[PDB]
Amino acid sequence: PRVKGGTVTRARRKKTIKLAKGYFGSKHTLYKVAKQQVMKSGQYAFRDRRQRKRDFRKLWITRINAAARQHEMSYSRLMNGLKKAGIDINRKMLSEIAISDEKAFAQLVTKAKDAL
Amino acid sequence: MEAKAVARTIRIAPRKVRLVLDLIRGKNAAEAIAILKLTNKASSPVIEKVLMSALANAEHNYDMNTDELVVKEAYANEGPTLKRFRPRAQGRASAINKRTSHITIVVSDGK
Amino acid sequence: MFAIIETGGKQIKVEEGQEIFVEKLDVNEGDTFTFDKVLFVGGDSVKVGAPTVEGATVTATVNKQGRGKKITVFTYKRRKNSKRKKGHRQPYTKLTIDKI
Amino acid sequence: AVPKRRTSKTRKNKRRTHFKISVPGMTECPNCGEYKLSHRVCKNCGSYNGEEV
Amino acid sequence: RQTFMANESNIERKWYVIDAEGQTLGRLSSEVASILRGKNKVTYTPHVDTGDYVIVINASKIEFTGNKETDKVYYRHSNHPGGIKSITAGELRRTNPERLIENSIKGMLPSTRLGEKQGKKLFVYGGAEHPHAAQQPENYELR
RNA sequence: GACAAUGGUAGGAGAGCGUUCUAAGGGCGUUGAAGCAUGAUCGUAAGGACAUGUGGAGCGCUUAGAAGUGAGAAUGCCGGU
RNA sequence: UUAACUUGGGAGUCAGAACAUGGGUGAUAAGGUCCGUGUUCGAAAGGGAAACAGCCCAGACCACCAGCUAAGGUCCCAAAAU
RNA sequence: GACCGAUAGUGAACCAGUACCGUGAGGGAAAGGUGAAAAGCACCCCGGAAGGGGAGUGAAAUAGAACCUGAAACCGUGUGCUUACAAGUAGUCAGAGCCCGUUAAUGGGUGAUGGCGUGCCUUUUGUAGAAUGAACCGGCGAGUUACGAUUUGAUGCAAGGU
Ligand SMILES: [Mg+2]
């Protein structure tokens, strides 16, 4: 029996265009142009879940380095002592202590100089 | 309370109409009759003859006065073409698209 | 005050009356959980400060356990016929902090 | 020489910013009480009023 | 989750004036291009304007070691054909010492939508006075 | 519950969604079907529902059968712009 | 430590490229051309070499705003020792 | 009739080998649908007329002979956020400020500023390639059946099977 091409070329070419709303100009209207931007906007996102984890570490190290220099110590002298003086567990997301409570961040700097 | 009078499939183009309909939008209805009677284009008496039907269907059969009326929206959509050809040189032929237009004038009275 | 807990291979700065993403634990809803491993507990005046300090435990109370938003994972390569397409919902656990 | 690309709908609508007509520059014909185009006579009853035509 | 993002009404930016006498040219312009980007402070984030306004006085007494006074040249072009123009760092100290430091610093600033706004927190003066006494600066002992 | 594996074009092997039609068992439909339109929903993928609007008489589900069985490109072919 | 031979079902391929190292031909010429052994690209993403299939470190099951390291790096652009 | 349902099945569901092309033999398309019943819009009003808007027939004219449902491309009119010192394969991930309020879930629209980022196929030792192809949207458009051959999976019997 003749299988007529039914309502599957409606629906398959909506659920790509509806993913692609918010794009400039013709990249949200036409099929072929908004198709091949959806294939690249799920490829850019795949290397940006892997890059997000290592570019928020190029920021936490920047804040700690701009915290120990006012106590007159390097950064590389700060994550040396806190592995060697204490067994203060390696954490750099918890440079939130240096922002919030400067009185709390001062006693760590005391303990780092104490056994180095 | 608001009226309208739609004229459709007028022989004139759809881009040469909406230069004149751009000019009278949001203006008092007493002026806009007498702006279309001073411009020297080709679609001024055509638009004028349909503005004077939204100003007679707003006084008759709704019974509102024609001293307070204001043009709320006036827009020109597109009607079907008439594809005729033109015999061009070296045995070729090019297609000439005579387009037609729909004209809609809607007056209001601020209520 | 505040304290630093260690839950899912990573560390969370938490104070009081606070709700959190934590990756999946083994409790039903309406239960009570206990973090026996705290690191730097104390605000301005309260201090201990220690390598994996002992004695202080932090409680919690589970509000719901569910799944995050679907993160569609696509990857193609040009000039070839290669593609892949997946989808993922990382399961979490929402808590509420009752005592330090 | 032919176009190299299809000119878009952003570049098309920008080019006809300056493509329009201007207002006629009307007056009020003070004897009949109509509108007329200035420095012209009236198409109805109407004087020129510096010339009474 | 628990991270901080300092924004348009969560920071202040106070003033610094730096005596630029008796010290070399590119050893000075690193403790200025880091003050303008704001790496002396915690609550440093990208994508906003932290930092401090920096004023430079005594531009006339910066230094050079070796023959940079005669063999460092500043090529610029003018987009007409045959238009390259040369100027040396010995005649630039004497003629226009306000430009010499101001391009020793703006070569060290980032991608140039925000690095145009960071560079314009810098005031370079030739003598020993400055009309910015109404803004209350202080001396900054740079290393 | 331990310890293991999992980049991949030509190509070999496996496992599935969907479309029209027929047979059998059950079922919704003018107190509104198919189709179309909008939506912040569900599954590991193709794909499945449901909620108001338009629409005006026929359509899905479970097991098995049979194919004119799936379109982004062929200076592809007819129609529209 | 974990492959290897045997019998049968189904295709693909027969245009190869740089670098390293033994030699021919050319001029101890070419990103030249023709053979032996090894690697990478072919069919391989990622960090480095400013940009750059073939050079150096290393083989992506998906998620995380945790951790320790390789080639290479620590004034500033640009993470880390003026 | 496990055959087609208006680009299908005859070239042809419409008065088809007909408009139309050729001196001639010969080549050859395009077309379908109001409603259950024409009850197919009396009369007033702007108009030279077309075409409208009321009143009326009808279950509905937002089914009026451009007559069932009415997709996309493409042209319009309105409005919440936004843009006139900036070098853009137009996205992505981090994110202030503003206007909202869904299938209720660690929500939606918009995007000042920062990081990374040279379209898709086809042929290649190798393409962002300034090598090939497509203006865009919609339909149609390619490993099939027969009678044999051989191996594999099933099943019925088995010195006998058919
Ligand atoms: Mg080009």
Q: What CA–CA distance (Å, rounded) separates B26 from E93?
A: 65
Residues D29, D46: contact at Cβ < 8 Å? yes
Instruction: Name residues whose C-beta falls within 8 Å of residue A15's C-beta, 6 or more positions apart in sequence.
Output: none
Q: Which two tokens stand for residue C55?
A: 């004695």
Nearest CA among C61, C62, C43 for reference residue C4: C43
Residues E131, E123: contact at Cβ < 8 Å? no
For chains C and A, tell me whether 3 or more CB atom pairs sit within 8 A of each other: yes
Residues A66, E44: contact at Cβ < 8 Å? yes
Residues D26, B34: contact at Cβ < 8 Å? yes
Q: What CA–CA distance (Å, rounded) separates C72 from D32?
A: 76
Q: Which two tokens stand for residue C33?
A: 């959980």
Percent helix, strand and coil across chain E, each to the nearest 5: 25, 15, 65
Q: What CA–CA distance (Å, rounded) separates C75 from C70?
A: 16
Residues C61, C32: contact at Cβ < 8 Å? yes
Chain A 44-63, CB < 7 Å to strand H:
44-45, 47-49, 51-52, 55
User: What distances in angstroms separate CA A51 from CA A48, A55, A57, B70, E41, one per listed residue?
Assistant: 5, 6, 10, 59, 25
Nearest-Cα distance to chain B for D35, in Å, is 7
Side-chain half-sphere of B66: how many Cα atoms within 13 Å?
A: 18
Q: What CA–CA distance (Å, rounded) separates A79 from A90?
A: 8
Å between CA of D20 and C1' of H77: 18
Q: What CA–CA distance (Å, rounded) separates B13 from A74?
A: 76
Chain E residues touching residue C13 (CB < 8 angstroms): 2
C20 → chain E, closest CA residue: E1
Nearest-Cα distance to chain C for A65, in Å, is 20
Phi, psi angle pair for D12, to nearest 5°: -75, -45
Question: How was it solved?
Answer: cryo-EM
Q: What CA–CA distance (Å, rounded) separates A32 from D44?
A: 61
**SS3 letters across A66-102:** HHHCCCCCCCCCHHHHHHHCCCCCCCCCCCHHHHHCH
Q: What CA–CA distance (Å, rounded) separates C50 from C41?
A: 9
Residues B31, B86: contact at Cβ < 8 Å? no
Å between CA of E4 and C1' of H119: 38
Task: Flag whether residue A106 sits within 8 Å of chain C, measured between CB atoms.
Answer: no
Å between CA of E8 and C1' of H98: 15
Which nucleotides of chain H does any protein CB come within 7 A of?
Answer: 2-6, 8, 44-47, 49-54, 66, 71-78, 85-87, 90-97, 105-107, 109-117, 119-124, 127-128, 135-141
Residues E49, E86: contact at Cβ < 8 Å? no
Q: What is the largest CA-CA distance in chain C?
A: 64
Q: Coil, strand, or helix at residue E78?
A: coil
Length of chain C: 100
Rg (CA), chain B: 17
Task: Flag whether residue A110 sits within 8 Å of chain D, measured between CB atoms.
Answer: no
Å between CA of C78 and C1' of G3: 38
CA angle, B1 then B3 then B7, to 5°: 165
Q: What CA–CA distance (Å, rounded) separates A17 from B62?
A: 46
Count of CB contacts below 8 A, A vs E? Answer: 27
Q: Which of the other chains make 3 or more beta carbon contacts under 8 angstroms with chain E?
A: A, C
Percent helix, strand and coil across chain B, each to the nearest 5: 15, 40, 45
Q: What CA–CA distance (Å, rounded) separates B38 from D44?
A: 13
Residues B70, B28: contact at Cβ < 8 Å? yes
Nearest CA among E52, E63, E70, E65 for reference residue E15: E52
**SS3 letters across A6-31:** CCHHHHCCCCCCCCCCCCCCCCCCCH
Nearest CA among E36, E32, E10 for reference residue E23: E32
Å between CA of A15 and C1' of F32: 29
DSSP state of E91: H
Q: Strands E122-124 and E53-57: what pairing?
A: parallel
Phi, psi angle pair for B10, to nearest 5°: -90, 145
Q: What is the largest CA-CA distance in chain E?
A: 58
Domain ranges of chain A: 1-116
CA dihedral of residues C19, C22, C25, C30 (deg, nearest 10): 10
Q: What CA–CA distance (Å, rounded) separates D22 from B41?
A: 12
Q: Which of the other chains make 3 or more beta carbon contacts under 8 angstroms with chain A?
A: C, D, E
User: Position of tokens 């799944």?
Assistant: C67
Q: What CA–CA distance (Å, rounded) separates D23 from C100?
A: 77
Nearest CA among D27, D30, D28 for reference residue D52: D30
Q: Which amino acid is at C71?
A: I
Looking at D1-53, which runs of residues are DSSP E strands? 26-29, 34-37
Counting DSSP H helices and E strands in chain E, the numbers are 5, 3
Closest Cβ opposite residue E4 in set A62, A70, A99: A99
Rg (CA), chain E: 17
User: Position of tokens 């010492």?
Assistant: E97
Q: Which two tokens stand for residue E13?
A: 């930016």
Residues A45, A76: contact at Cβ < 8 Å? no
Residues E22, E63: contact at Cβ < 8 Å? yes
Instruction: Name residues whose C-beta falls within 8 Å of residue B48's C-beta, 6 or more positions apart in sequence.
Output: B33, B36, B37
Instruction: Name residues whose C-beta falls within 8 Å of residue D53's C-beta, 6 or more positions apart in sequence.
Output: D41, D47
Q: Which amino acid is at B81?
A: T
DSSP for chain C?
Answer: --EEEE-SSSEEEE-SS-EEEEE--S--TT-EEEE--BS----SS-----TT-SS--EEEE--B--B-----EEEE-TTSS-EEEE----BEEEEE----
Interchain proximity D26–B39, CB inside 8 Å: no
Task: Flag whether residue B20 sits within 8 Å of chain D, measured between CB atoms.
Answer: yes
